[model samples]
Target: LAFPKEFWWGGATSGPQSEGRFAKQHRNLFDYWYEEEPDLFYDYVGPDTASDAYHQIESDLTLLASLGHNSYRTSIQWTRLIDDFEQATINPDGLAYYNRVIDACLANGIRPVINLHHFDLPIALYQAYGGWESKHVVDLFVAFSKVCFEQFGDRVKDWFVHNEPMVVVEGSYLMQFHYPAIVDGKKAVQVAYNLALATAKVIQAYRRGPAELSDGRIGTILNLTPAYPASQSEADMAAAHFAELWNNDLFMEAAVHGKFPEELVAVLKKDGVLWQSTPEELALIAENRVDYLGLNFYHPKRVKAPDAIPVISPSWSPEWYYDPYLMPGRRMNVDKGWEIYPEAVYDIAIKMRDHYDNIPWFLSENGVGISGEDRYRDETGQIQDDYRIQFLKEHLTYLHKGIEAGSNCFGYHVWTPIDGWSWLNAYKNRYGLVENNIHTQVRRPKASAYWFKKVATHNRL
Candidate 1:
C-alpha cells in the first residue's frame, strides 16, 4: 500500500476524441479531415459520432463516480468554444456545454483536470496559418487561453496547457499521422519551438488570470519514451542519448529549465533547424515554467547504433543515427505492436526524481489497447478483460515501488474511463475501463473497471 493519502485516481480523455457532436458553428482539423477524406479514419468512423459524449455527459460522469474516480482529465475543444479562430469569437453554446460538464464533475465530487489543447487545433488556424509553424498562432493561442481563464478558471483549479505537444510535432511533421503531414525535420523543429512558446505564454496567462484556489496550478503532459542503449559501445550509447535528446529532452528541458538542452540546441543549430525566437519570448519562457508535470508512459525505446554509416544531410531523421533494438522475448501488445514494459514506469519515475528537481507529477495515461475486446466478454455479458487488469496491476506495482522510493507522484489516471474514438485508430484500439457498444451507445463496466474500483477504494495494491 505504498500510495499517498489523497491520491487522485481516475482516467484521462480528450474532448475531440470523445464528444461527437460536430457543431456547425466551428470546425477543427479533424472535422476538416472528416469532410475531405472519410476513409482516412479507422473503419471510416469519423468523429461526428465519436462516443456521443456531448449528449451523454451525465451518464458518463455518473459511471466515473461509480469507478471511484476522484479526478478526471478532459479538454474543451478550442473549435467548439470559438466561432471564429481569426477573430477569437465566442460561442455561447460551447461555453454552456463545458459549464455543464464541469459542474457535473464537481457534483459527483470529482476533480476536473482540464486541458486547453489535446491535438485538436482549430481548423481555421491550421488552414490560415499552417498550424504551429506560424508565429501568429502563438498570440492567437494566448488570446484563447485568456478566454478560457476568464470563463472556467474559477471552477477548475487543475489545468494542463497541452497533452504531448511533441506528439503533435512528430505526427504532423514527421510520422504522418496527423493532418498536413510533412516529413521535413526543419519544419518539425519550428513547429516544436512554436508549441513550446504557446505553452509558456498560456502559462503566463494562467498565472495572471483568476484562480479557484490559491494554489491553482498549470502544467503540460509529456509522453516519455525511455531510451536504452543496445550495447556498451560508445556509438550505441551515443545513439541512445541522441534519441533521448530528440524525443524526451528537447521539450522537457525547455519546459522545466526555461531553455532547450544545450546539446539539442547545438544539433538544431548546426543542422539549420533552429527557429528564431526573440529575447523577450525566451525570458517569458524561463519565467513561466510549469508548476508541475504530467507524464504519460506507454512503452520504452530501445536504441542501437545504425548498421550503416550516418548520412550528412540537414534533413536527417531520428532513425538515421539509430535503429530500434528488438529485445528478445519481450512482452508485447500484439495488436498495437508496442512492447509491454511495466518496469519502465519505475525507471521514468526515478529519472524525474533524480534529474529534474523531482517536481510533482502523476501517471497521466497508462493503459493497454485491445482490438475487438468484445471477444473477451464473459457469458454473463460483462467484458472479461483480465488482460487489461493484469496490465494495469503490473504497471501499478512498479509505480507503487517508485512512490515508496519517494517519487513525488500524487495521482494515477488511466488513458480513458470509457471506450472512445482514438484519432486515426478510431474505436479499433479500445483502452477503456468501461466497454462501449458504438452501435447502441451502451456502456458496460468491464471486469477491469470493477478491479480498478477496488484498487481506488483501497488506495493499495
Candidate 2:
C-alpha cells in the first residue's frame, strides 16, 4: 500500500483534555461536567488530572517522533487565549506553553495541526452570550479567530476553526447531555446556524489576510460515522437517512453546500424549534465554505422508523432512538462498550467522497478507547497492547482502500497521543499510543506505538 508523498501519521489530543491544569490556567467559567462533580468523567481521575501534558510535552513528542510520525494534532484552549470581549489579552505563560509544545514537534520534524476549538469554550463567552445561542457570538468568535491566525498562523499553517461543532449542538441544545443543557429544539437549530455562520466568517476573515498566510487554509472538524440501517426494510432505511441528516449532515451541508439541508429545516420547523435566520447570515454562509475537512469517526448508528404509534416515557435516554436497534454481529470494545467496526472508516471515507464533492479531507481522529492498562503491561514496565495494534491495522487497511479508491483523504491521525480528558468518558478509555502516568507525569510508549512507527516510516502494513 502507498500513501500520498507526505502522508501525516500521528495521534491527536486536545488542550482541555490533555493539558492537565484546570486550576493553573483558571480563566473564566467553562462549565464542563467536572465543574460540579469531582468524578463525573468515566475515568477514576478527572480533567484536573488528565494526561498531564502541562509537564510531559518533551517525553510525549519524543515518543511520537520514535513512531515516525510526520504530524501532530491538538487544540488551543480558547479560554487560555481570549477573555469575554474577545479582546487581546495574551498570557505569557499560555503563549509559552503552546510555543514549547509546537517547537518540540518542529524540532522532531512533525507538522502541527492546530484545532482552534475542541469542545471547549471560554467560560466568559458561554456565560455572557448564553453560549452559541447569540448571533453576536459569531463576531466574538471571529475576533478570537483572527487573533489566532495573526499570531500563530505563521508557525501553524493548518487551522481548524472548530472541532466537532455539531457535537455542541447535539449535546447541549437537542439533549440534556452536555453543560448548560436545555432540551429546546429551536435553540439547537439557532445554535447550529450560528456555528456555521461563525465558521464561515472566520474562513472569510482568513482569506482577506496579508496574502501568503491566508492561503494556509481554515477548516472545521466534523464527526461522520456513516450511518447504516438496522435492517434492510424501508422503515429502517428511512430511519437511517433521518439519523444521518440529524447527526452528520447538519454541519457537512453548511460547510460544503453553504446551507442547511431542507429535510433538517423541515424537522425544526415542524417541531416549532426553528428560529428565524437573517438573509445576510444565509448569504454569508452560501458565499464562503471551508477549505478542507477534518473527519472524526468513533462509531456507527443504527435506527428504525418510529412504530407508527406514540409511547409516552417519563425520561429520555440519550442513546435510545425512537425504535432503536443495534446492528447485528458487531464486535464490541467490552471495556468501553463502544462497538468495534474498523470497516466503518473505509465506508465513511467513501461516503464523504460520494456525497461531499470529493473535497480534500484528513482523518483528524480515529482510534480505540479502553478502560485501563493494568492487564496489558509486561514485567519490564511496558504495555503490550496488541489489541490496540490490531485495531490500528484494521483501520489502516480500510483507510488505505479509501486512498487507493481516490477518496482524496490526506492522511490519518489517531484519536490521541496521551490519554486526555474526554468530555464525558474522562480518562476511562486510553486511546493514546503513549501512556501517561499522571503521578510523575511520565509517558510510556505502548506496543501500538511501535506498530504505528513502522507503518508511518514504511508507509505500509
Candidate 3:
C-alpha cells in the first residue's frame, strides 16, 4: 500500500518522556513523584535522565531525519516554558532550547509537529490550583498556548493543543496511574471537562494569535481505545456505547464537533458529578473546533454490561455502566500485556470517515514495546526487532485499508523513534526504532529503523 505524497513519517513523543529533567525552572508532577518514591518506577529509573534528549536533540533529530522522516511530533514542557505562572514570564533557557529544536528540524528536513502540552504540568500549578480540575488552570494553559504561538507558531505549522488528555484525567482522577492519584469520580468528571475546555480555549487563542497560528492546522492528540460490545445484545451494545461515549467520544466530539454528548452529560448530572462550567465556556467550545485530529490507537476496548439491569451504582464512575472483558482468542503483545488487534485501526478510520465528518487526521502514535530487547542483538550491533516490524506492518496494513476506503489520513507516527523513559514503567519496555543503550547513553538503530526508512522514503509498504 502506498501512502500519500508528503505523508508525515517519524514518531510522536513528549518532552517529559524523552527529554531529561535538566535546565528547567520548575519540577513537574512526574519529576516530583519520582523523587518522592523512587521505587515506584521500574528499576529506580525515572524522568531524571530520560534518554537525555534535552542534551541530545541534535543527535536524535538527525537520526530521525536519517530514517527518512518528513515530520516529527513532540511538545514544549509547560514546566520548562513558563517560568512565572502568575506573570506568564517565558523561560529564556526553555525558549532557546525549543528554538534550537525547531531550527534543527528545519535544517534536517523534518517538519516539526509541535504539541502545546503533554502531561508535563508544573507541580507548582498542581499544588496551587489542584491541576486540571480548576478553570483557573485552564485559563493559565490558554495563556501558555498564546506564548507558544507567538514564539514558534511562525515556524511550526502543525500544532496539537494537548496530547492524550484523557490519560491525564484517568491517571490523576480515576485509575490513579499518575501523580496525585485519586479515585474520585466527581473530580474525574471535573478534570475531564477542564482538560477539554482547556483544549478549546487554546484553539481559540491560537486562532486569535499570530498570523501563522491562525493559518496553521491546530488539533488535539487523542489515544483512542475503540470500545466494542461483547455481543450484539442491546444491553451489551448500550454498555459499549456508554464506554465509548465517556472514554473515546468525550474528547473526540469535543475536539471535532465542539459538543458534549447529551447522554453522557445526563448521566454525570444525574450522578451528581457533572463538571462546573459556564454557558459561555460551552459556547466557546462550540465556536472553536479542531482543524484536524491526531489519533493514537493501540488497542480496542471490549465491554460487557453489568448483570444488573438498568445500571444502578453506589458511586459515580464511567465504569459503572460496563465492565471490561478479555476477548476470546485475542492476540496480544504479551511483552507489554496489551491486546493486539490491528483491525481496530481500520475500525477507527471508518468511524472517523463516517461519523466524525472525515476530518483530516493522522496516525499519531502506534508501536509495540518489548522488554529486554538486547537479547536480540546481533553481531552488527543492531537489535533484530522483527516483532516490532511485524507489529507496525500489521497496523499499517489496516491503516492502508482505511485510506483505500476514503479515510482522510495524512500521516503515520510511531510512539517514538528512540527508546525513552516512561512514567511507572520507566525504561522497562523498549518502543523505539533505535536501540538505546540505557547504561552507556549510546543509541543505535534497530532493524525496524531501516525498515521504516524504506517505507518512509518510498511512501509505500
Candidate 4:
C-alpha cells in the first residue's frame, strides 16, 4: 500500500458506448451509422443495445464500488438529455435517468465524474450546424452544459467537457472510421479549433455557475500520445515535434494555458489549413481554462520526417510533416493491435509536471483491450486475465514512480469496468475488469477485478 491516503482508483465508461441507446429521442452519429450500414459493425451488432446500462445503473455503480472504485466517470448523452435543441429544453426522463446514476454512485460512496460528451453528437446538431465546424454549435453546447450543471452539479463535483476531443476531428474528418466520415484538411482544422473553443467556453460557463455554487472542479480529457522521434537528426526531431504540437499539445494548451500553441498555429497558417477564429473568441479561450486534466494514455506515437516532400490531394494533410514509424521489435497487444509500452506513462507524467504548469491531473484511462476472454476462463467461471493484471501493475509502477517524483497525478482509472460495445469493434475486444456477457448482459468479476479491488482498497499496488 504505497499510494496516498485518498488516491483515486476506478474505471470509466460512456453512455453511447454502454447505455444501449435506450429511450434516446435523437440518434447520434453511431446510431446513424448502425442504421445506415449495419454490416460495417463487427458481428453486425450496433449501438442499439449496449451493456444495457440504462436499466442497470443501480447494480452497475454498486458493482463498480465492489471492484474498489472510489470514483467512476461516465457520460450524459446529448441526444438523450436534450430532446428539443432549439428551445434549449430538457427531457424529464433523461434528467431522471442521470439523477438515478449520480444518486446511485453517491449511495455506493463513489464520486460521480460526469462528462458532457464522448465523441457523441446528436445527428441533428451535425446536420443542422455542421458539428464542431460551426461556432453556433459551440453556443448550443454551452446551453447543454449549463443545463447539466444546473441540474446535477450540486452533487457531481467533477465535470468534464469532453472525452478525448481530438478523436472527434480525427475520426470523422481525417479518417473514415466514424460516421459522416470524410477526409478534408480544411474542414478538419475548423472542427478542431471549434472543439477547443467549445471546451473553453464550457469551462467559462462552469466557473460562472457551478464552480462557485458547488465547489466543483471542471476539466477536459486529452488522450495525450507521446510522439517519439525516429532519430536524433534535426529533420527527424522537427517532424516529431510538430506532430506533438499538432495532435498532442493543441487541446491541452488551450485548456490548461488558455491558448493554442503558437508554433502549431503558425504551421497551420503556413499550410493554409488554419481554423477560422476571432480575437474575441481567442480572448474567451484565454479568459477561461480548465481546473484539472484527464489524460488517457494507451500508446506512444512514433514518427520521422518524410523521406521526400510528401503531397496529397488535399494539398497538405497533417501527415505531410511526419511519417509513422514502428518501433522495431516492440511488443504488440495482438488483441487491440496497439503496441504495449508502459514507459510512456512515466514520460507523460513528467511532461505534465515540467511543461503543463504542474496542474493536478489524473490517469483518467489506461487499460488493455483483449479478445477471446472465454478461452481464459477457469472452472470457477472467472476469467484469468493475469495479463491484464500484469499490464495494470507495470503501468501503475511507472505512474507511481512519476507521482513519487512529484508529478501531481492523483488518480488512476482503467478504460472501462465492463465489456461493452465500441464502434465497429463492437465487443470483439474487451477492456473490462469485469467480464460481461454480451448476450445476457450479466457481469462477472474477472481475476483482475479482485486484484484491482485489493489494490484500490489498500491504496497500493
Candidate 5:
C-alpha cells in the first residue's frame, strides 16, 4: 500500500552531528559534552571538531543525488549562528555554507528540510537568557527562527522549528541528560511551557507569509518512542501509561491540544512541583499550535514498575514508574541495543491520527546505529549491514500500513544518509550508509548504502 510516491524518501542529519568542522568554521562557545573529552568520537573522530564536510558540501549532495534521495534534512547550529540575537552581524561564512548546502540539494533534485534549533544550541543564549528557561530566550529564538525562515524559506520548503523541544525540558531542565544539567522540575515545567509557546509562535511566524508561503511545512520534531506495557498486570499498564504521559503526551498536549495534559498537571500538583502558569501565557499556547507533526522514531519501550526510592515533590523527584524489560521474543539490533519494533510505527501514526485529528505527519528520523568497522566487511571491502536493512524494511512496512489506513502521513526519512557524529556515543555508533573514515574523512559506502540506493531509486526496498 505504501510507495515512494506518497512518502518522502530521504535521510536526516543534524547540524552538530554531521557537517564535520563545528569548531573550525565557528567559534566554539560554552562546552557541550566535548568539554569533558574532546577526543570522544565514533571511530575515533571527534565532534564537528572537523570531519571536512565544510569543504565537501557539493560532493556530499552529489553523492545523495547519485543515491536517488529526493529529500535531505539538516539542522542550523544556533551557537554557530551570530551570537544568539539578531543584533550581532550574521556570520557571512556560516550563511554561505547553508546557502550552498540548500542550493546543492535543489540542484541535485533533493528538497532540503531545515531544523532551526537542533540539539546544538547557542551558548550565548544559555549564558545570557538561561537558554529556553527564560522568556528572553524565547524572543531571541523567535528572532533566530525568523532569520532562517526569511533567508532560506524561499528554497527550503520543509522547516522544523525545533528538534525534540521536550527533550530540552525533560533532559536539560529536569534531568541531567543535556548540558546546564538542572534538575528542578518546576524550572523544567516552565521551560517546557515556554518551548511550546516558542514553537507555536514560530509556526505562527511561518504562517505569516514571511516570504511567499508556498506549500512549505513548518513544525517541531518530537522524538516519539511508543511504550508498551510488559504484561496485562495493572502495574505494568499503569507504568506504561505514566511513561506515555511523561514523554509522548506532554508534547502532544501542548503542541496540538495547546495545553498541558490534565493528567500531567494532576501529577505535578500532587507532588507540589508544578509551576504556576500565567493566563496570558496559557492563552498564547492555546492560540498557537503546529500545522503538522514530525515523527522521529528510534525505538520502543517495554515498561514495568520497579520498586525504588525518592518520594519527593515533583520538582524534586520525577514520577518514575516504568522500567524497561526486554520483550522475550523481540528481535534486537546486535550493534545498537535498540529493539526491532516495527509495530510501534503503526501505533505512533494511528495514535496521532485518532488523538490529534489525523494531522499531517512524517517520519522525520528512523535508523539503526552500528559499531562501524570491518568485522562484517567482505574481502572486497564491502561492510555487510544487514541489520540496518531489516530495520528499515520492517519500519517502512508498518509506516505503509498507517498510510493505507488514512493517517495523512507525508514522508519517511531515514535517520541518516551518511554516517555522522552522535552526542551520547559520539561517532561510536554509525548510522550512515556513507561510512565516515575518522582518519581520512573519506566517506565510503557500506552494504546498507547500496540497499538504500536501490530503495531510493526504485522507491522500495
Candidate 6:
C-alpha cells in the first residue's frame, strides 16, 4: 500500500440524506418538488424521513470513531443556515447544530472536512431567481459561504465549496432528476459556469477570512468518469474526447488551471452558450485556485460515435456526438446496472499526474449500493457485505498502484459511514459501513465496517 504515513481514513454524509429533522424549517428546491409531486419519489419517502442524524449525532460520531476514522466529511446545509435566502439572514439554531457536530468530532478525535453546498440550495433562491442560472445567485452563494466560514471556520480547517456541481447541472437541466427539470443545454451551461464561478469566489472568501487553523484548505469535489473510446477509429476517438471534455475536464480545468479547455471553449462558443466573461471574473477565477482536489469515482464512461447524429441546435449537448458503449463481459452491478471497472482509478491518477502537474488529490467517495437489505443480512442478523469489502479493496488496490507509479493520491473516504436516504432513490440503494433501520433508527455495523477498521488500523489492504 503506497499511502502517506498519516493518510486520512473516514466516510462522508450529507445533511439532507442523514440529518432528518427540521427539513421543512428551511425549504430547498427538492422540498418544493417533493411537495408538488410526492409520487415522483420512490416509496414516497422524502427528506423529512432521512437517517435522523440530527438527533443521533453523538452515537453516529462514536460509531465512526469506533471504526478508527481519523477524519470525516459532511456538508453544512445551505437552507439550514439561511432564514431568508434573499436577505441572507443567519439562523441561530443552524449555527448551534453545526457547532455541536464540529465539537463532537473534535471530542472524539476526528477531523471534520466541512462542505458548504451539497446539492441542497435554498428554495427561496430558486423560486425568486433561477438557481445557479442567475448571475446574481453568485453573490448570494458567496454570502452563504461567508456565513459558514465565519461561524464554523474556527474549528473546521478543511472546507469544500460544493459537492459534484456537474451532477447538480446535469440532473437539473440535462436530465430531469433534479428540481426545475429542463432539458435545455444552454441553461445547463449557464448553471455550470455559475457553479464554478461560485466555487472560486468561496475560495477567495476563505482566504480573506480569519480561520482557526493557519493552514486551512478550501476545495471542491468532482466526480471524474474516465471516458473510454469503443475503438481507435478517428471519429470514435473524437467522440470520447468530447465526452471527457464535457463530463470531467470542464470543472477540473477551471478549478486548477483557472481557464476552460480550448476544445470545450470551441463547443461552448459554437452553441452560443459560452459565458460572456468579464476581466474581473477571469482574474478572480485565475488567482483563487484550489489548494487540493477531492475526487469522487463511481464508474467510467465508455463512449463511441453515435449511430445517428441529430441536427445541431443552439443548446450544447455532448450526447449528440457520442453514445454509451456496453462493453462485452464487463463486470456489472446487476441490480443497479452500473459497470464495475476498477482499473479506471489508475488511469485517472496517471492522467491527473501527467496532465495537471501532479495536483494533490484524495479518494473522497467510492462505494457500492445494494437495494434489498434482506439479501445481505444473515441469520445472525448481521449484513454479510463481503462483496462491498471486496469491491473497495479492488479499487484501492488499483489506487495504491497509482500511488506507487508516482501519482500524488493520498487518502480514501467511502461514500457514507451509515446507510442513509439517497436522493430520488430514497432508501433503495444502501451504501454504508453501518446499516440504519429507517423505522427504528437503530444502527448496526456491517461486515465491511470491521474489515475496514482492521485495514485502517494497519494502513494497508
lDDT of 5 by residue, 146-197 (tens): 6777778889888888888877776687767577767787788777777778
Q: Give the clash count for each candidate.
A: 0, 4, 0, 1, 4, 0
Off by over 4 Å in 4: 210-214
Q: TM-score of predicted model 1?
A: 0.97
Question: Across residues 1-461, which tens digit of lDDT does each residue of candidate 6 receive?
Answer: 64678888998889888897573467777777788888988799888868988888878999889888999999888878787766678888887888889999999999888888888987778877887888788898898888888877788888889899999999899888988888888888888888988989988988987536436888889967689999999999999999989999989998889887899989888777787667888789898888888899988789999999767565567688799999999999976899999999999889878987798888899999988867878999999998899999999999999889998887899988999888888888899999998889899999999999988878987
Cα lDDT tens digits for candidate 3, 135-210: 8888888888888889988888989988889898888888888989878888888889988898888888888875
Per-residue lDDT value at 58 in model 3: 85
Tell me how far the alpha carbon of residue 138 in candidate 4 is from the true structure, in angstroms, after superposition. 1.0
54-166: candidate 2 lDDT, tens digit per residue: 77777778777877888998888776666445555666677778888878888888998898777676656677788788877778778877777777777778888888888
Tell me the spans in candidate 3 whose CA falls farther than 4 Å from its real position. Answer: 307-315
TM-score, candidate 5, is 0.92
Report the candidate with higher TM-score, 1 versus 4.
4
lDDT of each: 0.87, 0.77, 0.88, 0.88, 0.76, 0.86
User: Root-mean-square deviation of each candidate, in angstroms?
Assistant: 1.4, 2.5, 1.5, 1.2, 2.5, 1.4
Against the true structure, candidate 2 has what lDDT? 0.77
What is the lDDT, from 0 to 100, of the residue 285 in candidate 6? 89
Candidate 1's residue-wise lDDT over 114-231, tens digit each? Answer: 9989888877788888879898987888788778888887788888899999899988888888887778887888889899999889988888754453258889998666899988
Candidate 4 residue-wise lDDT, 1-461, digit = tens: 39866888999899999899788888998899899899999999988888899998899888888778899999999999897887669999999999999999999999889899998888888898888888888898899988999989888889999998888888888888877888888988888899999998898888788345548888999967788999999999999998988888899899999889999989888778898889999999999888898999887789999877845464357788899998889988987778889999999989999999889999999999888998999998899999999999999999999899899998999988988888998998999999888889998899999999999998987
Clash count, candidate 3? 0
User: What lDDT is reached at residue 177 by model 3?
Assistant: 84
Residue 378 of model 6, lDDT score: 90
